[PDB]
Structure formats: C-alpha cells, structure tokens
Amino acid sequence: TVRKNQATLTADEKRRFVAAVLELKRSGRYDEFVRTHNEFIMSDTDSGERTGHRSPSFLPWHRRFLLDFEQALQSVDSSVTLPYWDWSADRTVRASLWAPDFLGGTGRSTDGRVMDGPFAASTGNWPINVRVDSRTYLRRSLGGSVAELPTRAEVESVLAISAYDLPPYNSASEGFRNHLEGWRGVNLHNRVHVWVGGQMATGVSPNDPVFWLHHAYVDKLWAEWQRRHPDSAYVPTGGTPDVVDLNETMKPWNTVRPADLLDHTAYYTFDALEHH
C-alpha cells in the first residue's frame, strides 16, 4: 500500500478514490467515522481523559483511524490508498486538489456552499448528515478565517523538536506532538482546519473528504519526525493518569496500543520519505 501525494495522482487514481469515498457514503459506512470523530472531539479534555486529540496519542489514534478508513475504501476498490495533501507545498486555492475532478473548490461567498466537484451538494451524492450546524451541504471558505497555510520552513521548525511530547501531555505542552497538532507555536494541523473552513473547522470535520488527506500528511510528518529523531520515541511510557501510555490500549478499538502504530511500514509506505 503506497500513500501518494495527492498532487501526483493520475486521473484514474483520482476517479477511483472519489468513487470509493462516494460508495462508503452511499452505503452508510462513511457517516459513522464522522460521528466517532466528533465524540472524541467533545470528550478529549485537557484536565480529564484524552485519547484522540490534545494528547500524545493524537498521532497513533489518527494513524489507526485513517487505517480503518483506508481499509473501508479498499473493501470497495482494493487499488485505492489514502493520498496525502502537503499543504506546505500545494498552498493556494488553485491547487489541483481543489479542481472539479478531485475535491472541488471553495464555497461560494454567501453561504459557504461548495458548488463544484463530486462532493457538491447539488450532485445529490454528499448529504451532510452527522452535523451540528443544521445545514446539510458541504461548506468551505479556503483562506477565509486565516490568511495562509503553514510553510515548509514552519514545518521544518516543528520537525526539529526532539521531544515527542512533554508533561502535562495536553494542549499546553511544549514538544513535537503539540506543535504539530498546533495548540502551541506557529500552528500546523489546527490552522489547516481553520483555513479550509466549513465543516473542516468543526468536530464533524471528517464530513469533508479533505480531512483524510490532511491527516495523511500530518501522519507523514510524524514518520518524518521519527526519521529525524531515531533516538527519540513516544512518551509517556507508563502509569500516567488520563493519558495513553506507550503500551496502553486506546479507545475505541481497545485492541491496539501506541506501540503497535509507531512503525507505519507494517501497514503502508509513502511515495517518498527522506531517510535519516
């Protein structure tokens, strides 16, 4: 399974990815990923139990969540893998990601409604069901709520941080995980959510298919951090209240630990990953 930069997909690969995503939606399987995600967004807290977000297990949790989704896509078309969006490189509304043959573009100015591409509400193929804002169409405002996506220099400054995470293991932490997540510092992953806008700015962000491509690139940046820091590893490593330690199992699966997810190559490789 090779996860490819979205910018590099062939037209056949874009077609097959879109068709597989639309079939998971039609069959009812897609929306349960959205619902699981929002339940962890609302439950992960800085002063209580935290698993999917604002915590060291943000990275392995999303790695397993994306693997579950990729496996669902491969049950519809075994050739499909999750592409990744390098938003430090493909940083304008003109990127091919946002063309009508892939994810469609930004929302129109009055209501945020996406008007083109396969996920536009007018197609009848992308109802927004699991939602908090009651409107039922995909919305985006690319660049509307924050001026710029992160740059490669900003990504490199976060990749240089040697500690994986640090006490208190939450949104106040220094260290790599929280700078990648974006609650402190120049802000990588959270700012991308804000830049897309629409459902991507909410706890039901997996309503936009770009969610998966954003997280596939966040996941690639974890793999890049590990190659840069082969001497550094997941923390904490035992007996931490409310935080998933290295060898502790993680909800909702309960049958997998961060330790089982550190090495992505057990599951997929990237088109390119520079080596250490």
């Binding site: 929002n38 339940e39 967004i41 609302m42 439950s43 992960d44 807290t45 800085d46 002063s47 209580g48 604002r54 209501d111 945020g112 939602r131 908090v132 804002d133 009651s134 409107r135 709520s145 924050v146 208190p168 939450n170 949104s171 106040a172 974006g182 609650w183 959270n190 700012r191 959510h193 804000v194 700015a201 909410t202 706890g203 039901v204 962000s205």
Partner: protein
C-alpha cells in the same frame, strides 16, 4: 472559578452562557435555546464544536463565533 454567566442577542440570535458522548463539563452555552458543546483549554481559552480549532478568549466569544459560523441556521443538539 467559572466564568460569569451572560445573556445577549448577538446578530439576531439569543446566546446564553452559565456555569453548569462528550465531556463533563463545567460551563453551558445555548444558541436560541439549543445547547452548544464548548470546552476550555488549559491556557484559559475556549472553543466550541462548531469552531473547534480556533481558540477564543471567553465562552461568550465562543458563542459569538458559533453564531458567525451558523450564518442564521438553527443549531442541532448534541448527543446527550
């Protein structure tokens, strides 16, 4: 200490806040009587589920960001 309560009409929507599937949960916000899930971050900023990735300083600011997000639309209640 919890933030103070508030009650105003913001952009034609009634927003209310008060000290009190999702977390437990020390402050409640409502938009036209529908409860909006909100959360406080360790640095004292706030977010809501409809503007989750963009911290703002106060629960009233989170309620106002939700009204801005909704563009007039009703809020749906959250599970539980």
């Amino acid at each position: 200490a919890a933030p103070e309560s508030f009650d105003e009409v913001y952009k034609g929507r009634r927003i209310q806040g008060r000290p009190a599937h999702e977390h437990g949960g020390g402050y409640e916000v409502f938009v036209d009587g529908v409860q909006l899930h909100v959360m406080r971050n360790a640095d004292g900023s706030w977010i809501s589920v409809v503007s989750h990735y963009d911290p703002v300083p106060t629960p009233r600011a989170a309620a106002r960001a939700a009204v801005d997000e909704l563009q007039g639309a009703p809020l749906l209640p959250f599970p539980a």
